PDB file of C-alpha atoms in Angstrom:
ATOM      1  CA  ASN A   1      -8.132   3.926 -22.671  1.00 46.32           C
ATOM      2  CA  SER A   2      -6.762   1.160 -20.476  1.00 46.04           C
ATOM      3  CA  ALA A   3      -3.246   1.725 -19.163  1.00 46.17           C
ATOM      4  CA  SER A   4      -1.147   2.320 -16.064  1.00 47.19           C
ATOM      5  CA  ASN A   5      -0.623   6.092 -16.438  1.00 49.37           C
ATOM      6  CA  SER A   6       0.328   6.731 -12.817  1.00 48.35           C
ATOM      7  CA  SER A   7      -1.173   3.540 -11.440  1.00 44.42           C
ATOM      8  CA  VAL A   8       1.006   0.504 -10.807  1.00 41.25           C
ATOM      9  CA  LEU A   9      -0.596  -2.312 -12.786  1.00 38.56           C
ATOM     10  CA  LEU A  10       2.781  -3.976 -12.475  1.00 33.28           C
ATOM     11  CA  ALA A  11       1.634  -4.496  -8.904  1.00 30.27           C
ATOM     12  CA  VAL A  12      -1.811  -5.900  -9.722  1.00 31.20           C
ATOM     13  CA  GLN A  13      -0.175  -8.835 -11.493  1.00 28.28           C
ATOM     14  CA  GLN A  14       1.669  -9.880  -8.352  1.00 30.80           C
ATOM     15  CA  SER A  15       0.778 -12.141  -5.437  1.00 28.90           C
ATOM     16  CA  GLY A  16       2.272 -14.444  -2.810  1.00 27.68           C
ATOM     17  CA  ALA A  17       2.907 -11.926  -0.055  1.00 28.23           C
ATOM     18  CA  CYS A  18       1.094 -11.803   3.266  1.00 23.05           C
ATOM     19  CA  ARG A  19       1.034  -8.621   5.351  1.00 20.25           C
ATOM     20  CA  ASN A  20       3.421  -7.064   2.825  1.00 20.98           C
ATOM     21  CA  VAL A  21       2.298  -3.749   1.411  1.00 21.69           C
ATOM     22  CA  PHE A  22       4.497  -0.812   0.468  1.00 24.21           C
ATOM     23  CA  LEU A  23       3.257   2.688  -0.313  1.00 24.04           C
ATOM     24  CA  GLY A  24       5.722   4.862  -2.157  1.00 26.30           C
ATOM     25  CA  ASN A  25       4.047   8.141  -3.160  1.00 23.53           C
ATOM     26  CA  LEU A  26       2.017   9.548  -0.296  1.00 25.39           C
ATOM     27  CA  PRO A  27       1.388  13.238   0.484  1.00 25.77           C
ATOM     28  CA  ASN A  28       3.249  14.985   3.268  1.00 27.11           C
ATOM     29  CA  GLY A  29       1.215  14.806   6.435  1.00 24.71           C
ATOM     30  CA  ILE A  30      -0.383  11.444   5.681  1.00 27.16           C
ATOM     31  CA  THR A  31      -1.161   9.698   8.945  1.00 24.57           C
ATOM     32  CA  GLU A  32      -1.689   6.025   9.671  1.00 21.37           C
ATOM     33  CA  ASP A  33      -5.162   6.748  11.008  1.00 18.70           C
ATOM     34  CA  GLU A  34      -6.127   7.818   7.483  1.00 19.64           C
ATOM     35  CA  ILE A  35      -4.723   4.747   5.757  1.00 17.76           C
ATOM     36  CA  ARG A  36      -6.119   2.551   8.547  1.00 20.13           C
ATOM     37  CA  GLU A  37      -9.661   3.847   8.290  1.00 19.72           C
ATOM     38  CA  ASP A  38      -9.341   3.575   4.538  1.00 19.21           C
ATOM     39  CA  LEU A  39      -7.841   0.094   4.242  1.00 16.62           C
ATOM     40  CA  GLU A  40      -9.237  -1.730   7.256  1.00 14.06           C
ATOM     41  CA  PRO A  41     -12.819  -2.110   5.831  1.00 14.35           C
ATOM     42  CA  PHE A  42     -11.401  -4.552   3.284  1.00 16.28           C
ATOM     43  CA  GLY A  43      -8.148  -5.382   5.012  1.00 15.53           C
ATOM     44  CA  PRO A  44      -7.356  -4.749   8.678  1.00 16.90           C
ATOM     45  CA  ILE A  45      -3.759  -3.725   9.317  1.00 16.63           C
ATOM     46  CA  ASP A  46      -1.643  -4.269  12.444  1.00 15.97           C
ATOM     47  CA  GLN A  47       1.394  -2.251  11.446  1.00 16.12           C
ATOM     48  CA  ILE A  48       1.543   0.964   9.441  1.00 18.14           C
ATOM     49  CA  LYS A  49       4.773   2.936   9.317  1.00 17.31           C
ATOM     50  CA  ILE A  50       4.717   6.150   7.329  1.00 16.80           C
ATOM     51  CA  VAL A  51       7.901   7.918   6.416  1.00 16.45           C
ATOM     52  CA  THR A  52       6.387  11.203   5.278  1.00 15.05           C
ATOM     53  CA  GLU A  53       9.922  12.516   4.777  1.00 15.35           C
ATOM     54  CA  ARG A  54      10.263  10.149   1.824  1.00 17.41           C
ATOM     55  CA  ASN A  55       6.543   9.901   1.013  1.00 15.14           C
ATOM     56  CA  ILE A  56       6.652   6.177   1.746  1.00 19.57           C
ATOM     57  CA  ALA A  57       4.709   3.849   4.038  1.00 21.40           C
ATOM     58  CA  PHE A  58       5.131   0.243   5.127  1.00 22.51           C
ATOM     59  CA  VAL A  59       1.879  -1.563   5.875  1.00 19.96           C
ATOM     60  CA  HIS A  60       1.460  -5.016   7.391  1.00 19.56           C
ATOM     61  CA  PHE A  61      -1.885  -6.643   6.584  1.00 18.07           C
ATOM     62  CA  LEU A  62      -2.318  -9.446   9.132  1.00 18.75           C
ATOM     63  CA  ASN A  63      -4.265 -11.625   6.701  1.00 19.56           C
ATOM     64  CA  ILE A  64      -2.821 -12.462   3.302  1.00 20.71           C
ATOM     65  CA  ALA A  65      -6.172 -11.827   1.583  1.00 23.66           C
ATOM     66  CA  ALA A  66      -6.551  -8.513   3.402  1.00 24.58           C
ATOM     67  CA  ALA A  67      -3.454  -7.247   1.625  1.00 23.93           C
ATOM     68  CA  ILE A  68      -4.578  -8.670  -1.709  1.00 24.25           C
ATOM     69  CA  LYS A  69      -7.924  -6.903  -1.905  1.00 24.59           C
ATOM     70  CA  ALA A  70      -6.478  -3.712  -0.418  1.00 26.15           C
ATOM     71  CA  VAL A  71      -3.537  -3.562  -2.846  1.00 24.88           C
ATOM     72  CA  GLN A  72      -6.006  -4.258  -5.660  1.00 24.78           C
ATOM     73  CA  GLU A  73      -8.450  -1.562  -4.501  1.00 25.27           C
ATOM     74  CA  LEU A  74      -5.914   1.105  -3.543  1.00 28.12           C
ATOM     75  CA  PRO A  75      -4.919   1.751  -7.217  1.00 28.98           C
ATOM     76  CA  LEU A  76      -8.590   1.929  -8.222  1.00 28.55           C
ATOM     77  CA  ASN A  77      -9.364   4.666  -5.725  1.00 24.90           C
ATOM     78  CA  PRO A  78      -8.861   8.411  -6.292  1.00 26.29           C
ATOM     79  CA  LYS A  79      -7.039   8.962  -3.013  1.00 27.27           C
ATOM     80  CA  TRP A  80      -4.965   5.831  -2.950  1.00 29.75           C
ATOM     81  CA  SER A  81      -4.286   5.866  -6.690  1.00 28.23           C
ATOM     82  CA  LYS A  82      -2.147   8.903  -5.901  1.00 31.40           C
ATOM     83  CA  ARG A  83       0.087   6.457  -4.078  1.00 32.74           C
ATOM     84  CA  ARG A  84       2.230   3.727  -5.549  1.00 33.63           C
ATOM     85  CA  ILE A  85       1.542   0.463  -3.749  1.00 37.29           C
ATOM     86  CA  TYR A  86       2.772  -3.056  -4.394  1.00 36.15           C
ATOM     87  CA  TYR A  87       3.349  -6.358  -2.642  1.00 39.66           C
ATOM     88  CA  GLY A  88       6.537  -5.891  -0.721  1.00 38.50           C
ATOM     89  CA  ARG A  89       9.093  -8.507  -1.599  1.00 38.33           C
ATOM     90  CA  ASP A  90      11.095  -9.424   1.481  1.00 36.36           C
ATOM     91  CA  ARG A  91      10.953  -7.063   4.472  1.00 36.48           C
ATOM     92  CA  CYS A  92      13.231  -4.424   2.974  1.00 35.74           C
ATOM     93  CA  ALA A  93      10.780  -3.546   0.206  1.00 37.57           C
ATOM     94  CA  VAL A  94      11.474   0.163  -0.193  1.00 37.45           C
ATOM     95  CA  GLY A  95      13.512   0.105  -3.388  1.00 36.75           C
ATOM     96  CA  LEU A  96      15.207  -3.242  -3.821  1.00 37.46           C
ATOM     97  CA  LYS A  97      12.665  -5.940  -3.086  1.00 39.67           C
TER      98      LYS A  97
END
């Protein structure tokens, strides 16, 4: 089959957002070091703020393309697919973006 299921394909059809990446479905205990080491090989990040209390993380990918490939690869990966990531509209992209 070919569907979203628990993956945000609604996010893969988006663009036009540099450094703007929001993760809203992480496990408790997730640390930036993990996301860094995982996302930096395709997209180096300068700012990663994880609110484990709400299972959400705000990532800032310095290069626009770094965010693109990362946000496109995150949903395709077994670890990151567990998380809901999209291009953050505006800076307050946590619910209303």
